[PDB]
Write a protein that binds this ligand. Sequence first.
Ligand SMILES: *[C@@H]1O[C@H](CO)[C@@H](O)[C@H](O)[C@H]1NC(C)=O
Ligand SMILES: *[C@@H]1O[C@H](CO)[C@@H](O)[C@H](O)[C@H]1NC(C)=O
Ligand SMILES: *[C@@H]1O[C@H](CO)[C@@H](O)[C@H](O)[C@H]1NC(C)=O
Ligand SMILES: *[C@@H]1O[C@H](CO)[C@@H](O)[C@H](O)[C@H]1NC(C)=O
Lengths: 336, 328, 134, 135
Amino acid sequence: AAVEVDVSASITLQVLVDAPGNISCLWVFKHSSLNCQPHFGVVSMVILKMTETQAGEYLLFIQSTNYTILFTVSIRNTLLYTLRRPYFRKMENQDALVCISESVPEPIVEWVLCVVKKEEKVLHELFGTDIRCCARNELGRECTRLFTIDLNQTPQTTLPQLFLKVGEPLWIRCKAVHVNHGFGLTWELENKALEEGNYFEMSTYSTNRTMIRILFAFVSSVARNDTGYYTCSSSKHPSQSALVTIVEKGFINATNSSEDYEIDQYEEFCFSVRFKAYPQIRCTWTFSRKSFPCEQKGLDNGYSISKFCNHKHQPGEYIFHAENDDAQFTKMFTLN
Amino acid sequence: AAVEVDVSASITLQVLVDAPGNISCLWVFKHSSLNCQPHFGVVSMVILKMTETQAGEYLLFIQSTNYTILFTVSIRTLRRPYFRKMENQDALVCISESVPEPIVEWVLCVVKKEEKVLHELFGTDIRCCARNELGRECTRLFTIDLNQTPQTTLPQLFLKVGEPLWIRCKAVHVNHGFGLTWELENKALEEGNYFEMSTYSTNRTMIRILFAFVSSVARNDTGYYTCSSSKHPSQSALVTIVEKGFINATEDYEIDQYEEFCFSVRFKAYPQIRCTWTFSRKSFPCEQKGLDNGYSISKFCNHKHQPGEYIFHAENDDAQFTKMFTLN
Amino acid sequence: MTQDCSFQHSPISSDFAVKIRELSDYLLQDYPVTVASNLQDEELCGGLWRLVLAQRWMERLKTVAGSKMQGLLERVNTEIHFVTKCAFQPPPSCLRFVQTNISRLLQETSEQLVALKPWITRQNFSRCLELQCQ
Amino acid sequence: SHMTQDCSFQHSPISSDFAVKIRELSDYLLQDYPVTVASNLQDEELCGGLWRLVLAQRWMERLKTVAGSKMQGLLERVNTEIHFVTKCAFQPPPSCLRFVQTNISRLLQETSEQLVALKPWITRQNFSRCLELQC
Ligand SMILES: *[C@@H]1O[C@H](CO)[C@@H](O)[C@H](O)[C@H]1NC(C)=O
Ligand SMILES: *[C@@H]1O[C@H](CO)[C@@H](O)[C@H](O)[C@H]1NC(C)=O
Ligand SMILES: *[C@@H]1O[C@H](CO)[C@@H](O)[C@H](O)[C@H]1NC(C)=O
Ligand SMILES: *[C@@H]1O[C@H](CO)[C@@H](O)[C@H](O)[C@H]1NC(C)=O
């Protein structure tokens, strides 16, 4: 019901009710009347450059039933600080990828191919290694790693699981290295063919006349439809796969039990926490009010293991609080 | 090629050659023969609990080609780097001694170049590093940058009698029209104690290196050294030379578990000392940091309001020391 | 037969224009090379004939190139070496060559790769094996 | 960008690492690129190498104009090693001077050699009589 208009913006305002039939509307603007002609049922009022004049109380009365709607159009006098993780988009111009990271303040967008850093926001040398984009502002650094399937490389005996919220863009690069250029690559889903506007192929040469091929698959905006087991096969390589899980809300799965420990100031020890969580969580190790952040590193098994070592032989409660955009968590660690 | 076996260890020894094909091996153990059946090509000899008997000369002959491999299986010091200018050309060499033999890497700050022989001696922060099983001991090349801003406390350089003195004087100027000169006790330095290198930089800039060196120092060589350039200001550094390794340092205490305090020890010692803070048998090492005044000040804070004798024992290769700190 | 010429998978890389810009960055642009002056107009074999010739030039150049120029040549050579996968017949007596700048040869090579990229795997190039004069 | 006439150098304009900048240029060169060398330079053990360096220097400038963005840097860097010859008012080549086409690899090699032989004497000699090239 609450509308936030950022500057002289050009957007459309539509509302639909599950009953399309011979029904009539009437728009009731800021202390003035307005005529309408909608679609079957969905009604709309679109605006190009919303002036401080074109804002406020906007109602819409309907009759089959005799309904009434009301909207409060406000303006962006407020610009709240944030750090939304990087997204990807293939430049329409050529065979290259672009990093779309949102944040308040605006961040440093750097592509890192592992290590080598190249702050460009537009990456063209997409071939191999560990490719990850990183956003860095006043808040901090949030990174989105490009999901890779190396058919040339050894298999990860875990069958990778890829999670993402409905509407987010799916990105899976399949890289294969072969001696001669004579080999192809193909994408497939469990009992469903891959869309023509969901695939792209790049190729270059390596060392002594070697050929590397990148056959990446992408989804503009994901849905329940797009969730499933994806597989990449090469005409000179073994078919390696990964399953795509669509999520409604963010989650943190960690064996929370609040564990108790005890050691003598002569022993070398580090507190641990294994967790499978999405999106990448913001973690904090707090003790007797003194809070220190964490090296939230990945165990690659199918979870990330966060560690803490600066115990300083100090006894007491070491609490680990970790949280993402749509989920929270806290684990109590007693020490003697 | 050199194998280090720690106790009755259980490890595998495999070697692979980039050519997998119908090739045959033959293992040649310590003065005895042995049969093999490998993988396609990678060959191996694995051992569970390597006894003093199961160690020594172990060869492996192959045939497609007719190759032969040899391994020296052994069972379970680190003297800091020294410098020697290559007699062949205008380049420096790192002489670091150690048991086991170390990784000698030149680091120009940062950029690491493991070569043991450095030819690109121009500017930045040049330091050689030795790295073995024991650890990593580094010797930084003493530099005097006339081009750079001036530092305080007449750069005091300490070294033991017999050690090699190394002072590189770097000056950067617009045109090549400028010279460099070394002086000790306001005199013109020995002919076999100086060397000049030069190269170009950015917009036809010139960098000059006029380094001074002593093969083996004595009490004779100790003194105030100065480098002056014919387009730069004369910056200096004093050299302190001792017969053997030394430790020079300049107590009872009492406090209530409410006061924040740290024990201190100021010392001028060469070479860099290995220090240890021991109390009621429980020993903890120290942050042997430098005070830059003309001595290094070691500190200890984790008193834990615990009363008694806190003893500080510090020692180098040719000297020892201990100081007793009472607490109530 | 062994008198055929076709490619199942694309022997033309996406980043070939990069390797040519990199070679050109260390080249003396007016180095004299040659190009066929009277190649018959054949929109199927045309670029392929010139790539074969350009390819023959990358080899000649490698032999008189410095240690590091050899790498840049070889790397451009790899981008167009696939033409030797086919039994191309030696140039006919009618074929006239004209002296041109290596910058011209490199530029044309890039152009030929671009034009050939969408068709290299769809066409049968068996009749390109005999170079023809217009 | 300086002056000219009478010719001597107080401090060594020849670097120690000049052989490096030449090996680096040569690593990106097409070795038989045609350059020229004077064929009939009078034998003068004092001006000889200096005359050829002046000529080699004139070639580094001509080459920079037809060099690619990255080759320009390698040429310029070798040009700097021998640019000091322009600190002196060298007279234009005489009519008697004949030039012969040679490989740039030959020119680069000779330039290195001339710098080596000139390195111990560049600051001890008065090169005022070298300003006029002789046949
Ligand atoms: C799956 O994608 C197709 C093509 O875009 C679309 O028509 C269909 O609605 C999608 N399925 C769901 C359940 O959204
Ligand atoms: C986390 O564990 C809970 C246990 O009830 C389970 O319901 C949930 O599916 C798990 N989440 C994931 C992402 O596996
Ligand atoms: C974890 O378990 C402990 C012990 O029952 C409890 O105090 C704590 O609230 C739990 N934390 C979460 C995030 O569920
Ligand atoms: C010390 O050695 C130097 C070497 O250059 C020599 O000139 C000097 O006379 C020596 N001093 C004494 C007191 O022998």
